[PDB]
């Protein structure tokens, strides 16, 4: 997972997001980051509880 994370981080450093995805997900807003992070953390909470 660390190796894959490094590779994906390099990809996301090099490649710009698509225009359609940018507009759809509102990548210029920070509340979308907040919502996605909250989703990830509650997923992780369910996994660790199980």
């Amino acid at each position: 997972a660390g190796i894959l994370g490094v590779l994906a981080g390099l990809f996301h450093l090099c490649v710009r997001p698509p225009q359609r995805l940018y507009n759809g997900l509102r990548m210029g807003n920070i509340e979308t980051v907040l919502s996605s992070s909250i989703a990830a953390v509650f997923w992780a909470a369910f996994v660790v509880s199980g």
């Binding site: 225009q19 210029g28 807003n29």
Partner: protein, 231 residues
């Protein structure tokens, strides 16, 4: 004029050179099926309205089309090049990768011949007990790790200080003591072609090395021996 055929040669017998590859670079074979060096076009999206004092806060629209100019080096120390997808930056990356791969291939072969250990187990053997050609070194592994990090960082920070994109690949000067390809002639072009071909061959060969050790569990000479003693 006998014993062969008279016959620019591309990577396919019948194919056309891409527009962005004009054949001026040394190893230019017109090979770019994915078009990674094609001049990229982008778009500019206006800033989102996030004002808390306004009734309506709409998203950002398209300001207009925007195609940047690449292959320009600046004094940034963290992003010197104008764009990631440029031909010159890709050439510099290819040259550095190839030189490292050439050194790696030769060193793995020579170390395997001299010491008798595989190039994979050599890392662990040196980690447990630092050595070189059977001679125990006077340094501790912690000191060696810190020294390697510091020295490599200093060398690469020295290398990054150049600003001319041409001299970023062929610095010359103290790195060409014999003055073999330090002018502008046909003799330097052939040497650059040979260097780029050797770089590509060594890159493919070390990808070999790595995969072969992954699959068969052997090194380079070990893989040769295992292949020979299998018929």
């Amino acid at each position: 004029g006998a014993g062969y055929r008279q016959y620019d040669a591309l990577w396919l017998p019948n194919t056309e050179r891409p527009a962005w590859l004009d054949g001026s670079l040394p190893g230019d074979r017109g090979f770019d099926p994915l078009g990674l060096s094609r001049p990229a076009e982008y778009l500019q999206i206006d800033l989102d309205e996030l004002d808390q004092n306004a009734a309506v806060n709409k998203a950002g629209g398209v300001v207009g089309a925007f195609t940047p100019v690449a292959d320009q080096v600046s004094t940034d120390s963290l992003a010197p090049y104008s764009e990631v997808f440029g031909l010159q930056r890709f050439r510099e990356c290819e040259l550095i990768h190839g030189r490292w791969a050439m050194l790696a291939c030769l060193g793995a072969l020579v170390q395997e011949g001299v010491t008798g250990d595989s190039w994979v187990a050599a890392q662990t053997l040196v980690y447990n007990q630092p050595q070189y050609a059977g001679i125990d070194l006077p340094f501790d592994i912690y000191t060696l790790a810190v020294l390697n990090s510091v020295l490599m960082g200093x060398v690469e920070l020295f290398r990054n200080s150049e600003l001319d994109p041409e001299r970023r690949c062929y610095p010359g000067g103290a790195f060409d003591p014999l003055n073999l390809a330090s002018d502008d002639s046909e003799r330097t072009q052939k040497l650059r072609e040979a260097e780029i071909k050797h770089a590509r061959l060594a890159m493919v060969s070390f990808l070999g090395y790595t995969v072969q050790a992954w699959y068969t569990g052997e090194g380079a000479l070990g893989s040769l021996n295992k292949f020979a003693n299998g018929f």
